[PDB]
Amino acid sequence: PRLVLRALENMVRAAHTLAEIARDNGNEEWLERAARLAEEVARRAERLAREARKEGNLELALKALQILVNAAYVLAEIARDRGNEEELEYAARLAEEAARQAIEIAAQAMEEGNLELALKALQIIVNAAYVLAEIARDRGNEELLEKAASLAEAAAALAEAIAAILEGDVEKAVRAAQEAVKAAKEAGDNDMLRAVAIAALRIAKEAEKQGNVEVAVKAARVAVEAAKQAGDNDVLRKVAEQALRIAKEAEKQGNVEVAVKAARVAVEAAKQAGDNDVLRKVAEQALEIAKKAAEQGDVGVMQKAMDVALRAAGQA
Amino acid sequence: PRLVLRALENMVRAAHTLAEIARDNGNEEWLERAARLAEEVARRAERLAREARKEGNLELALKALQILVNAAYVLAEIARDRGNEEELEYAARLAEEAARQAIEIAAQAMEEGNLELALKALQIIVNAAYVLAEIARDRGNEELLEKAASLAEAAAALAEAIAAILEGDVEKAVRAAQEAVKAAKEAGDNDMLRAVAIAALRIAKEAEKQGNVEVAVKAARVAVEAAKQAGDNDVLRKVAEQALRIAKEAEKQGNVEVAVKAARVAVEAAKQAGDNDVLRKVAEQALEIAKKAAEQGDVGVMQKAMDVALRAAGQA
Amino acid sequence: PELFLQDLRSLVEAARILARLARQRGDEHALERAARWAEQAARQAERLARQARKEGNLELALKALQILVNAAYVLAEIARDRGNEELLEYAARLAEEAARQAIEIAAQAMEEGNFELALEALEIINEAARVLARIAHHRGNQELLEKAASLTHASAALSRAIAAILEGDVEKAVRAAQEAVKAAKEAGDNDMLRAVAIAALRIAKEAEKQGNVEVAVKAARVAVEAAKQAGDNDVLRLVSERALSIAASSVKQGNYEVKEKAIRVAKEANKQAG
Amino acid sequence: PELFLQDLRSLVEAARILARLARQRGDEHALERAARWAEQAARQAERLARQARKEGNLELALKALQILVNAAYVLAEIARDRGNEELLEYAARLAEEAARQAIEIAAQAMEEGNFELALEALEIINEAARVLARIAHHRGNQELLEKAASLTHASAALSRAIAAILEGDVEKAVRAAQEAVKAAKEAGDNDMLRAVAIAALRIAKEAEKQGNVEVAVKAARVAVEAAKQAGDNDVLKRVSETLLSIAAEATKQGNSEVMEKAIRVSEEAEKQAG
């Protein structure tokens, strides 16, 4: 394992030196040799990364992704001086596909709570953003420049959110997350949305440990905002389950207003998902919330508790 | 190590079978192969015996000696039907120095007090002597019958005496030892007589534990009979040490008559060596015997103690 | 010990920052000051770098070489802008020596199968080559540029063969080695050819470990090509011995034809050794 | 298990003693009884000796073979007086297969380098011939006497050679083996020749361990002599392989002549395998 990664990286570094030497001298044969060398290494690296993911070692996988990103940088360096569109297209495909895989790694790492992997993965993603930018500029395409910028901003917000997950300021975390969904919704990238949602889920998980059900619901409001665009059914399920967990804490606190808002979120998500067991569990808890709101006896809150629970039943 | 002995023994088996088969045909070539093997076995076995005499595992040596006896039998079996004297002579010469070296092995074992090795070596000596006696009849050297016979008979008498030492009737052992020296004296090998004297020293060394100083003097009387033939200075020196040990105990036991006789034996040995240090130490203890006899008031024994002490002094 | 490398690196960094500053703020006295600091750091490192082979810590050795390579970048930059082709000579000699030493380190590591060090030494060689190319660009030495391209190609091929050995695809390794030997022939260095032969020996050793005698004969055929061009009798002897390993393994397989080839290869190696 | 052999020995002594008394008594019925006492042991013991090759306790195996040889003597002691050749032929064929199976045991023991068991098996072989010879004394075939003598001679020469290996001189051992192969050439048994070949292989391995490749070439040359006199392909493989092993050590010594010989003879062994 380790050796083969090192060796591939060293081959990429060799391709980098050769491309430097060739571009200084202007020799076409040396450029062609470099291109041939780089392509074969890229094909090798792609297979290695696919295997490393199946081995389930995320750390080795993200090193393989970094090797691929380095390879893409060299390929782009060759291509942008060579002057062919398919070479730039291949580099772009490599970069975006690596970024997809990297975000899937990051998503898994965030749900596992492995900060080290997640941080490394964001660095890989930032590096991919650099490669994408270099390609996009020299190719001349505003849409791909807009991808790179919006992805980079969303990544920066995710980094800020990860920092907030270390720091424990959940208001700061939500402030970041609001910008994160803003960027992600401007991009329309499914994996970026998936990442934002999973981040919001862990933010909520921590907010529950702190007992801050209010900010947890604010985070859930962002989570549904993203999830409603994305259609990740299992993420919608995780969101709905968490929204009920949050509502149960809001019941235990006696904060029926927060509990009713938590139901208002839960039903919004459930209506997209169509999961019947979730829908019935949601309506079940909606009646439990309404029961406790009736024990509090707040009439205007009960009109809402009615309206939500009855609308939920009207979908279920 | 032991592998080589097995191989040599089994080579003798082979040569023996080769002669056993060949005598029906008259196959002189098979007999010649056998004879050449038997000579080689003797040569290697002598080397083995010399090396074993450095290595100190006496069992390897005595087993090699039994192999030499067996090989000498094979030599004799081939030789007697050829009728040649040299073919008997070489085997006789080998057997003599083999037996002589075996007597050194037996001497060492009896001095160390390992009866097991003594019995083994003595049995080897009896077997070696059987080959010498068989050759002697077939060749007509009747004096070699005497020499073989005495060497055997003495070796057997020593074993019998060893059995009597183990039973504890030491005078029965002395009765055997008297016959042993007589037998040896009928052909007169000084090395055999050294081994006999060492056996008599073993008897004395054991008798010091038992306190029958009277029989111990009878054993010393055998010892000096043999030692006076051979003249080994350290044997004579050891005999003096034993005689003084016997005297020192016979004084404490009050048997000054046995003590005086022990001194009478002591000088009989010590005069042959002529070592003034021994002779003065002996005469000094002889005056201690005279002093002890005076302390008993045993007038005539004190006169005899004067006689023996002064006679002992009169030799230095 | 390690601190000396770290502080030597700091002196290189100070020299780098000074040189960068001096290109903005021109002063021949500061330029000479930087040149003195830089050459002193280089020679101070050189003492350690020569010493480290006696000490046998190859990691510290190749790290000392990395210092020399990094310093050579600064020396070349100062020299080419200042107009001192003698400092280009000194830097080139430092780099060429260091690379020659690194090739020996790589050979020893490949004899061990301690490929970690080999890959790193090859990395040092690549960076050394990068500096050499920067130097040669200003001298106009197209020959040195072709050699650098060849060298980097060859070190890459060695790296690929190494990877194929950790992967265990000895056939792909031999296919890569067939490229490597051509690249080394084009480079025209017998010590690089020794590295190629040592790699080919380690390839054949893997093929023997795995029992793949047929591919081992192909590996040996490449190995003896490299050795036949290099002229090193100790390599040719080791090749002949390995060829007899393959021959014995071929008789163990009962394959008379592969035995026959293995003997003919052992005899080619013997014919070149004389 | 052990009691079986001890009781069989007692029953063999009883049959012997009954026949000794029976000749004074002038009685044939006692000879019938004795022959039956003996046969009842012999057939069961033969099955045990065969079975023991599965069980791997070669000490009990060779002890059972010795019991069979001791019985064979007693059987001959009756049969030579009783005047029936079928009984003599049964005993002879039984003894021939017993000696042959002892050689099969010895071949395994010498391949394993267990000279200890080898000398004991060779001891069985040395004694076993005596019964065939004392039978042949009465049957009048000098040809059987020659076979018997030769059978002992070859096992004795192996014993003489084994001693020189344990004493640690491979050249003296090879000289003794050169006598042994001539003794086996007079004897004309392929399985004895296999025992010689296995010994010559173990000797060659010793000579390699001691670095005396020249002597090892002689040792293997004797090994292939035995195989060339009586064919065994797996011997010829092992020999040809070992001769490359010798050639490799000869390469390590730099002795091109001994290496070339070791290759040429490795090739002869392959050429004989065909």
Annotate A275-311 with DSSP letters as a single string: -HHHHHHHHHHHHHHHHHHHHHT-HHHHHHHHHHHHH
Residues 6 or more apart in contact with residue A67 via CB below 8 angstroms? A5, A8, A9, A12, A45, A48, A49
Closest to B222 measured CA to CA, from B256, B259, B185, B188: B185
Residue D204 identity: A
Interface of A with C in 4-23 (CB under 8 A): 4, 6-8, 10-11, 13-15, 17-18, 20-22
CB contact at 8 A, C106 and C121: yes
Amino acid at C226: A
How close, in Å, is residue C76 to chain D by CA atoms? Answer: 47
Alpha-helical runs (H) found in C140-169: 142-167
Count the Cβ atoms, other than its own, within 10 Å of residue C86: 8
The CB density around residue A274, as the number of other CB atoms within 10 Å, is 11
Task: Show the CA angle centred on residue D50, arms to residues D49 and D56, nearest 5°.
Answer: 80
Evaluate the CA torsion angle B216, B217, B218, B224 in order and state its sign.
Answer: positive
Q: Which amino acid would we find at residue B299?
A: V
Nearest to D244 among C237, C248, C254 (CB): C248
**Tokens representing residue B65 in the block:** 């000696």
Q: Tokens 């020794």 label which residue?
A: C194
CB count, 10 Å around CB of A16? 21
Q: How far apart are CA A262 and CA A224, in angstroms?
A: 11
Which letter does DSSP use for residue C170 in this model?
Answer: H
Interface of D with C in 243-262 (CB under 8 A): 244-245, 247-248, 251-252, 254, 256, 259
Q: With an 8 Å Cβ cutoff, is C245 touching chain D?
A: yes
Q: Is the dihedral of CA A59, A64, A66, A69 positive or negative?
A: negative
| E strand segments, chain D | none
Count of pairs with CB atoms under 8 A, one residue in C, one in D:
31
Tell me which residues of chain C, numbers 121 to 150, contact chain A at a CB-CB cutoff of 8 Å. 122-123, 126-127, 129-130, 133, 137, 142, 145, 148-149
Q: What are the respective helix, strand and coil percentages of chain B, to the nearest 5?
A: 90, 0, 10
Candidates C241, C252, C254; nearest CB to D248? C241
Cβ(C242)–Cβ(C207) under 8 Å? no
Name the nearest CA neighbour of A104 among A93, A117, A91, A94.
A117
Please state, in angstroms and rounded to a whole number, the distance separating the CA atoms of residues A213 and D149: 106
Q: Which residues of B55-64 are buried (b: 16+ CB within 10 A; e: fewer)?
A: eeebebbbbb
B60, B4 contact by CB (below 8 A): no
Give the single-character DSSP code of B168.
S
Residue type for position D86: E
Q: DSSP of C206-262, one letter per residue?
A: HHHHTT-HHHHHHHHHHHHHHHHHH--HHHHHHHHHHHHHHHHHHHHTT-HHHHHHH
Q: Which residue has the tokens 């730099």?
A: D254
CB atoms within 10 A of CB D55: 11
d(CA A88, CA A232): 31
> Are the beta carbons of A226 and A200 closer than 8 angstroms?
yes
One-letter amino acid for residue C2 of the chain = E
Q: How far is CA D249 from CA A220, C240, C253, C264, D213, in A?
A: 77, 11, 21, 18, 7
Q: DSSP string of A184-212?
A: HHHHT-HHHHHHHHHHHHHHHHHHHHTT-
Phi-psi region of D230 (alpha: psi -120 to 50; beta: other; left: phi over 0): beta
Q: Which residues of D touch B25 (CB under 8 A)?
A: 142, 145
Q: What is the DSSP letter of A57?
A: -
Distance from CA of D55 to the nearest CA of C (A): 29
What CA–CA distance (Å, rounded) separates A107 from A200? 11
Pairwise CA distance, residues D197 & D245, whole Å: 17
Backbone angles phi, psi at D119, to 5 degrees: -60, -40
Q: Burial code of D229-258, b = ≥16 C-beta within 10 A, e = fewer?
A: ebebeebbbbbbbbbbbbbbbbbeeebeeb
Q: Give the separation between CA B88 and CA A4, rounded to whole angstroms.
A: 82
Query: Which tokens go with A8?
Result: 């591939």
Q: Among residues B239, B224, B288, which one has the least CA distance to residue B260?
A: B288
Q: Name the burial class of residue B128, with classes exposed (0-12), middle (13-18) and buried (19+) by CB atoms within 10 angstroms of its CB.
A: buried
SS3 B84: coil
C266 chain-D contacts, CB cut-off 8 A = 263
Asked if A290 and A306 touch (Cβ cutoff 8 Å), the reply is yes
C-beta atoms surrounding D140 within 10 Å: 9
- The Cα-based distances of B313 to B224, B270, D226 in angstroms read 19, 11, 80
* Closest by Cβ to A13, choosing from C123, C148, C160: C123
Token pair 């019995």: residue: B119
Judge whether B224 and B253 are in contact, CB under 8 Å: no
- Choose the closest CB to C149 out of A4, A6, A30: A30
Distance CA B283, CA C50 (A): 86
DSSP characters over D87-118: HHHHHHHHHHHHHHHHHHHHHHHHHTT-HHHH
Contact C159 A11 (CB under 8 A): yes
Residue B21 to residue D156, Cβ atoms within 8 A: no
Buried b (16+ CB within 10 A) or exposed e, C204-227: bbbbbeeebbbbbbbbbbbbbbbb
Q: By C-alpha distance, which of D177, D162, D98 is closest to D131?
A: D98
d(CA D37, CA D18): 10
Breaks (C–N over 2.5 Å) after residues, chain B: none
Where are the alpha helices (H) located in A55-84, listed in sequence order?
58-82
Q: Name which of B72, B63, B77, B80 is nearest B96 in CA terms.
A: B72
Q: Count CB neighbours of D24 within 10 A.
A: 7
Q: Six-digit token pair at C242? A: 């390995």
Whether residue A7 and residue C155 make contact (CB cut-off 8 A), yes or no, is no
- For residues D49 and D5, the answer to whether their CB atoms sit within 8 Å is no
Count Cβ atoms within 10 A of the Cβ of residue D265 and give its class: 0-12 exposed, 13-18 middle, 19 or more buried. Answer: buried
Q: How far apart are CA C155 and CA A10, in angstroms?
A: 9
Instruction: Name the nearest CA neighbour of D123 among D58, D217, D183, D31.
Output: D58
Tell whether D140 is within 8 A of chain B (Cβ).
no
Q: Tell me if D158 sits within 8 A of D122, measured CB to CB.
A: yes
* R_g over Cα of chain D: 22
For this experimental structure, what is the resolution in angstroms?
A: 4.3
Integer Cα distance of D133 and D129 in angstroms: 6
- In eight-state DSSP terms, residue B187 is T
Determine whether the interchain pair C244/D256 forms a contact, defined as Cβ–Cβ distance below 8 Å. no
- Chain B residues whose CB is inside 8 A of the D137 CB are 24
